[PDB]
Amino acid sequence: MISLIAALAVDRVIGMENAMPWNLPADRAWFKRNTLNKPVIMGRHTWESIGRPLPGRKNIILSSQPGTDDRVTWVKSVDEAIAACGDVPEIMVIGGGRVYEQFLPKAQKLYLTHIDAEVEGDTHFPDYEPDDWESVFSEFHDADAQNSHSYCFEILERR
Ligand SMILES: NC(=O)C1=CN([C@@H]2O[C@H](COP(=O)(O)OP(=O)(O)OC[C@H]3O[C@@H](n4cnc5c(N)ncnc54)[C@H](OP(=O)(O)O)[C@@H]3O)[C@@H](O)[C@H]2O)C=CC1
Ligand SMILES: COc1cc(Cc2cnc(N)nc2N)cc(OC)c1OC
Ligand SMILES: [Cl-]
């Protein structure tokens, strides 16, 4: 099983200048929950965004160029990433825009955080047909002192 987990603003925005254009600790909490003790495949742009290994997960970076951090696994292809995760129950693909593009066709599950924010963005979740997917579970949260936007955590499964 391959799964994508991603936070989407109003216009499927996921990124602005190699950062998420919002601050939702409640999202980073939901991200940690569903990825922990599973392998994560991220693109080199996302690695640099996070800027440190994600504890309690084998970290797998996609980069044509050679590695620059001895604490994480590096791979130069999609097939190498996928192989690098090994015989596991679930592979979590955690960004960014170009990695999502490549993995979404392969993906069985979506872990979507829908954020009530119309924010300028250089990077968007790839398009898809909701025809192709069926809503499994969702959870709505109001904005609060720490999370300036309302948000909905959704899970979808292929057919
Ligand atoms: N909203 C959300 O849920 C999330 C937000 N983001 C946002 O996403 C943005 C980053 O997305 P984007 O700019 O598309 O980049 P990525 O984060 O997908 O990383 C791009 C890099 O990945 C490497 N790469 C990708 N595919 C391959 C491949 N098949 N073989 C080899 N290397 C590969 C390349 O590295 P190289 O240059 O070494 O060749 C490429 O330059 C940021 O703004 C970030 O904030 C990211 C995570 C989640
Ligand atoms: C743990 O912090 C980060 C996590 C992510 C990936 C990510 C974040 N949120 C969700 N819902 N899905 C994801 N795949 C991306 C990040 O930066 C772009 C992070 O830095 C704050
Ligand atoms: Cl690419």
Numbering used by the authors: 1 to 159
Tell me what the authors wrote about this structure, in their words.
TMP mediates its anti-bacterial effect by targeting bacterial dihydrofolate reductase (DHFR), a ubiquitous enzyme found in all organisms and thus also an important target for cancer and autoimmune disorders. DHFR catalyzes the reduction of 5,6-dihydrofolic acid (DHF) to 5,6,7,8-tetrahydrofolic acid (THF) by enantiospecific hydride transfer from NADPH cofactor. THF and its derivatives are essential precursors for the biosynthesis of DNA bases and amino acids.
To gain greater mechanistic insight, we next characterized the atomic structures of wild-type DHFR (DHFRWT) and mutant DHFR with an L28R replacement (DHFRL28R) using X-ray crystallography. Both DHFRWT (resolution 1.9 Å) and DHFRL28R (resolution 2.1 Å) were individually co-crystalized with the cofactor NADPH and inhibitor TMP. Distances between the amino acid residues of the enzyme and TMP (black values are for DHFRWT and magenta values are for DHFRL28R) indicated that there are only subtle differences between these two structures, particularly around the enzyme’s active site. The arginine side chain at residue 28 of DHFRL28R (purple in color) is oriented towards the tail of the TMP molecule where the 3,4,5-trimethoxy aryl ring is located. Hence, we predicted that a TMP modification with an appropriate polar group at the 3, 4, or 5 position of this aryl ring might induce additional electrostatic or hydrogen-bonding interactions and thus yield a L28R-specific drug candidate. Interestingly, unlike other mutations, the L28R mutation reduced TMP affinity while increasing DHF affinity. Our molecular dynamics simulations and biochemical measurements suggested that the L28R mutation leads to a unique and indirect resistance mechanism against TMP: increasing substrate affinity due to newly formed interactions between the mutated enzyme and p-aminobenzoyl glutamate tail of the substrate DHF. Also, in our evolution experiments, L28R was the most frequently observed mutation in the coding region of folA, with the strongest effect on TMP resistance. When we measured the in vitro affinities (Ki) of TMP and 4′-DTMP to DHFRWT and DHFRL28R using purified DHFR proteins (see “Methods” section) we observed that 4′-DTMP had nearly two-fold higher binding affinity to DHFRL28R compared to TMP at steady state, whereas the Ki values of TMP and 4′-DTMP were comparable for DHFRWT.
